[PDB]
């Protein structure tokens, strides 16, 4: 059997929508009492303005969340895949998950693996194979080599359907936000 591991990376949305003006006037009111009752170079809000086409760059979007999606090549297949790597029984899922972070992306991205339990598994057969879909949280991401020759794409769910058609790959949305 061919053992293959994959990682469904999650990128946080940096900035939420602006508050309504009706909230602002209330915010001003509470601020005034707050003082009375008180007891004793920045990055651009959106860094896509210059790029407009850098799907490769980690910062494809800042207002919304993103999920890494990397074109992968197998021995007999070449299809658009979620970050995929070959793993062994000795290595645990987090160890396989950690290897995916540096192997495929070769970057100093900041990720923490809190839960060893995997979120998704889908099998494609023609040779029996299975793909492991892990989940993790990103506080921040430092993606080196933005312009790689590979087709790595950071898209949460909008492009998941476009690039991952079959339910074995289009059902990743089930455990996605």
């Amino acid at each position: 059997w061919r053992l293959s591991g994959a990682l469904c990376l999650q990128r946080p949305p940096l900035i939420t929508k602006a508050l309504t003006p009706l909230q602002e006037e209330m915010a001003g009111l509470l601020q005034q009492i707050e003082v009375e009752r008180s007891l004793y170079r920045p990055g651009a809000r959106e860094t896509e303005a210059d790029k407009k086409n850098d799907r490769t760059s980690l910062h494809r979007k800042l207002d919304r969340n993103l999920v890494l999606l990397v074109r992968e090549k197998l021995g007999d297949q070449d299809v658009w895949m979620l970050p995929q790597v070959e793993w062994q029984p000795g290595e645990t899922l987090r160890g396989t998950a950690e290897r995916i972070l540096a192997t495929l992306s070769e970057n100093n991205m900041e990720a923490k693996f809190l839960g060893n339990a995997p979120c998704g598994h889908y099998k494609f057969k023609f040779l029996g194979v299975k793909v492991f879909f892990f989940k993790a949280l990103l506080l921040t991401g430092d993606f080196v080599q933005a312009g790689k020759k590979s087709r790595h794409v950071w898209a949460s769910k909008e492009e998941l359907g476009d690039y991952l058609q079959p339910k074995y790959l289009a059902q990743v949305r089930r455990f996605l936000l």
Binding site: P12, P13, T16, A27, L30, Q31, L39, L137, L177
Partner: protein, 89 residues
């Protein structure tokens, strides 16, 4: 037998009321999701202007539960509050 440790959330915001409002709001998020909150301690002012930091203790998480919760907190972010997750001493 291992379970998620108790991780304190230090809500730092220049506005005292906003941190308190968010601290109460996030706690309302916590109890609804069945998150136990043992304490709501308050840090001293960050004398330099000053800022106010309020603790919201969180005990008990799950792998799927943690992933969903943290994004919800980010979306819940009203204005100019810095989230923080740190393992309890």
């Amino acid at each position: 037998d291992y379970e998620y440790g108790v991780l304190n959330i230090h809500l730092t915001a220049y506005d005292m009321s906003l941190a308190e409002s968010y601290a109460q709001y996030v706690h309302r998020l916590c109890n609804r999701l069945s998150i136990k909150v043992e304490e709501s301690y308050a840090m001293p002012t960050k004398t330099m202007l000053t800022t106010h930091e309020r603790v919201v203790q969180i005990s008990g998480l799950s792998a799927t539960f943690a992933e969903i919760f943290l994004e919800v907190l980010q979306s819940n972010l009203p204005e100019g509050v810095r989230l923080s997750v740190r393992e309890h001493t």
